[PDB]
Amino acid sequence: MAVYPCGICTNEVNDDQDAILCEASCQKWFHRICTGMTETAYGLLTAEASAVWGCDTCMAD
């Protein structure tokens, strides 16, 4: 049973997978691939200490 089920696919978000936390609101983890986020966007968001990401559902709210 998943500890951090992906907000999109519901499969476990493992530490060795590209994945991002919806810090904007819902606090679920999301696989990078599931979100449609590029490798470059993922590296950028990682490097931006002051940036947080929100999932499509949370951003739409």
């Binding site: 449609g36 470059t40 966007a41 002051s50 990401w53």
Partner: peptide
């Protein structure tokens, strides 16, 4: 810093492509 800048996937993808081209600026509003 204390400020928190909130990105959607769409915005992050777009920002990322611009960063590679040396376009790093975004205008704050609220």
């Amino acid at each position: 810093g204390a400020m928190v800048y909130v990105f959607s996937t769409e915005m992050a993808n777009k920002a990322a492509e611009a960063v590679l081209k040396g376009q790093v600026e975004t205008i704050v509003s609220f």
